[PDB]
Amino acid sequence: VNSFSGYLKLTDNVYIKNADIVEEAKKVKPTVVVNAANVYLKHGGGVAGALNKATNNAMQVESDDYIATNGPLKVGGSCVLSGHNLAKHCLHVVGPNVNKGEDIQLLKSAYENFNQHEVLLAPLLSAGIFGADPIHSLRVCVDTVRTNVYLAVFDKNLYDKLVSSFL
Numbered sequence: 309v310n311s312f313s314g315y316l317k318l319t320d321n322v323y324i325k326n327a328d329i330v331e332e333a334k335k336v337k338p339t340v341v342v343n344a345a346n347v348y349l350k351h352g353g354g355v356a357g358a359l360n361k362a363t364n365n366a367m368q369v370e371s372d373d374y375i376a377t378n379g380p381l382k383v384g385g386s387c388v389l390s391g392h393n394l395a396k397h398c399l400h401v402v403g404p405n406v407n408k409g410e411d412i413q414l415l416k417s418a419y420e421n422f423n424q425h426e427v428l429l430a431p432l433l434s435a436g437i438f439g440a441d442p443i444h445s446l447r448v449c450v451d452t453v454r455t456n457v458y459l460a461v462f463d464k465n466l467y468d469k470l471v472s473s474f475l
């Protein structure tokens with residue numbers, strides 16, 4: 309039993325809700341919140357910009373030190389950093405950004421990072437400003453993640469389409 313509330317159950321392990329991931333994280337304070345990161349951890353907009361803003365830019369400061377030490381992530385890769393005031397940890401995961409021409413096949417590799425964590429709050433990888441089809445992202449999530457994932461979808465119209473079209 310966990311403290312996630314109001315989610316629709318899609319499969320044994322995948323749950324979905326129309327919610328702002330920032331407000332969800334502040335309420336639940338999950339062990340792991342997933343960020344929709346880029347390889348430079350530049351949290352400018354989309355999910356990343358919103359999460360970073362909610363940390364008063366502390367996420368960005370921590371991220372800049374991480375990059376200065378380690379260099380950029382790989383597309384499909386991840387790193388674990390602090391969750392600041394939002395969660396114990398933030399798993400920064402880089403899905404392919406279609407608006408940069410990145411290979412959508414890497415979306416499965418990106419979701420594989422979730423399997424290293426028993427329970428996660430997450431957005432749909434490569435959705436929004438990363439330019440992939442969210443219906444496809446949900447499909448890959450369901451077919452790749454085996455740990456317990458609680459998906460927050462910001463747009464109510466999109467949430468309804470994901471549920472009604474879910475196979």
Ligand SMILES: OC[C@@H]1C[C@H](F)CN1c1ncnc2[nH]ccc12
Pocket residue numbers: 327328329330354355358430431432433434435436437459460461462463
């Ligand atoms: O599944 C994540 C959905 C799809 C798209 F990627 C953006 N999005 C969000 N969901 C909840 N809160 C959010 N805050 C900022 C963005 C955002």
Ligand SMILES: [Cl-]
Pocket residue numbers: 353354355435436437438
């Ligand atoms: Cl977005």
